[PDB]
């Protein structure tokens, strides 16, 4: 349906495998030349986007306004093939308690996993590292799915960052953090 349509569309249009130090990750291009990639992915000076070795233009580890890890490494590259502005779908108000996870990372490249009920945990520790605005979905997930895009038709919630037990945890990509950047 339209939800899976959006997922498979987003995947092929703005999602591309960014291979870096920790392996292959889901490169979520926000717009033009800026894409987001997990911090734990360890993006360096040069990354392999779809195999294409591209050097970093600006690597900004996005932390939360409460000066805590947000875990979104704003990876700005001098991107020739500009990304479509999917920032309009990035929401501050999710309203999408029904989400789908599009994994395009190390363990699952091109894997649409509907998570079902998605909620938020607020503030918690992520790999013993305090991280802000953590999303919680009751859906058993594991390593390898981190970096995946948590989205629905019309709403991009963020990216899978990890998990705790049977509850998966994603980073809440609030429109506010991206709409302001230029």
């Amino acid at each position: 349906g339209p939800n899976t349509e959006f997922a498979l569309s987003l995947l092929r249009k703005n999602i591309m495998t960014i291979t870096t130090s920790k392996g292959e990750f889901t490169g979520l291009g926000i717009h033009d030349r800026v894409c987001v990639i997990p911090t734990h992915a360890q993006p360096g000076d040069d990354v392999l986007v779809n195999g294409q070795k591209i050097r970093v233009k600006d690597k900004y580890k996005l932390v939360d306004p409460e000066n805590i890890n947000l875990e979104l490494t704003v990876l700005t590259l001098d991107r020739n093939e500009k990304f479509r502005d999917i920032r309009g779908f990035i929401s501050e108000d999710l309203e999408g308690v029904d989400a789908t996870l599009v994994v395009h990372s190390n363990n699952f490249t091109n894997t649409i996993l509907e998570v079902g009920p998605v909620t938020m945990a607020g503030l918690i520790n992520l790999s013993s590292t305090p991280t802000n605005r953590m999303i919680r979905y009751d859906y058993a997930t594991k390593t390898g799915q981190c970096g995946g895009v948590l989205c629905a038709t019309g709403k991009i919630f963020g990216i899978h960052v990890g998990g705790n037990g049977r509850q998966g945890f994603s980073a809440q990509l609030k429109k506010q953090y991206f709409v302001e950047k230029q």
Binding site: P38, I124, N125, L126, S127, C146, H160, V161, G163, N164
Partner: peptide, 6 residues
């Protein structure tokens, strides 16, 4: 929670 990176 201490959720881990995945």
């Amino acid at each position: 929670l201490e959720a881990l990176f995945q």
